[PDB]
């Protein structure tokens, strides 16, 4: 009932309060050590700062650019098309709605990693070279 | 919620002062002075449980030594024979025999000289 509640076994935990004793360990110096910079209130230096020596990222050269346009295609293997059972046409108004492709960026590419094991009418924006052969083995179609 | 400092600084600073009654002057009244005498009176007692066991042996050996010299024997000739003549078990707290019954302590001295 409600007058007797137990948490999940191993789920909960106490928390360390520092500076509140001498035999709890974290006491009279709170787990920082003696004097220095990083035992001051708010000390500790910024990350990736070696100390005055020039850092890692000012010792390597820059490399590359963007290509502002940059098409991106969504991947469907051939192993993911055994989910469609009975002679089904594979349409972008169907290949999204089941749950194979979620939230595509541009048109669907059909790569070849698995096998179809079923004849299928397949329409896709770009096939690959090895996946437009295992469709032709079972007997299928194409459209770009 | 504001946890006010309640009645735990009463009680924690009584059960140190009440351990420290019988001390001179201010070492039984003030907190800070009777605190740090309680930390030393449980430290002196810790090396005085270990020292008590070996300073009652510096007394039993003194009585046995003042018992064999009137029978004209040393102490070091007495706890030699009683390991070697007999297998009289090593005991020095039982120098109570020499105090109580001198007639009882005499036959041991007979048995020590007998096989040494």
């Amino acid at each position: 009932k409600l007058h007797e509640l137990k948490p999940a076994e191993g789920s909960r935990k106490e928390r360390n309060r520092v500076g509140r004793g001498v035999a709890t360990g974290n006491g009279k110096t709170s787990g920082r050590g003696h004097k220095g910079q990083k035992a001051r209130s708010g000390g500790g230096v910024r990350p990736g700062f070696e100390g005055g020596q020039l850092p890692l990222f000012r010792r390597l050269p820059k490399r590359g650019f963007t290509n502002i346009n940059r098409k991106e295609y969504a991947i469907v293997n051939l192993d993911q098309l055994n989910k469609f059972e009975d002679g089904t046409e594979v349409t972008p108004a169907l290949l999204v709605e089941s749950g194979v492709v979620k939230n595509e960026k541009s048109g669907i590419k059909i790569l070849g990693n698995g096998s179809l094991d079923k004849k299928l009418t397949v329409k896709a924006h770009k096939f690959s070279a090895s996946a437009a052969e295992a469709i032709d083995a079972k007997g299928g179609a194409h459209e770009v | 919620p504001r946890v006010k400092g309640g009645t735990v600084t009463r009680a924690r600073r009584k059960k140190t002062i009440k351990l420290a009654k019988g001390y001179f002057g201010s070492k039984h009244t003030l907190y800070k002075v009777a605190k740090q005498q309680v930390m030393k009176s449980g430290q002196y007692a810790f090396r005085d449980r270990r020292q008590r066991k070996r300073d009652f042996r510096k007394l039993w050996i003194t009585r046995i030594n003042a018992a064999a010299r009137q029978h004209e024997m040393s102490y070091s000739r007495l706890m030699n024979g009683l390991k070697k003549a007999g297998i009289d078990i090593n005991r020095k707290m039982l120098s109570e025999i020499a105090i109580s019954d001198e007639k009882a302590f005499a036959q041991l001295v007979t048995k020590a000289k007998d096989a040494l």
Binding site: P47, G48, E50, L56, F57, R58, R59, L60, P61, K62, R63, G64 | -
Partner: protein, 64 residues
């Protein structure tokens, strides 16, 4: 506030498919007559940011 990516390090570094970074070798700017042909050729392949220096830059590259 949410953490800002160190922009001077995202220009120099890619992210691979095991978490480990990728960089380009130094000394590739000038003075190529003071370097051997067995040395100017092997400052060209790319390597990985070391196990030591990955301990320092865990927070600065969080959205890569």
């Amino acid at each position: 506030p949410k953490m800002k990516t160190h922009r001077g390090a995202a220009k120099r570094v890619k992210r691979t498919a095991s978490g480990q970074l990728k960089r380009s070798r130094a000394f590739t700017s000038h003075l190529f007559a003071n370097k051997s042909t067995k040395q100017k050729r092997q400052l060209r392949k790319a390597r990985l940011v070391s196990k030591s220096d990955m301990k320092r830059v865990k927070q600065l590259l969080a959205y890569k």
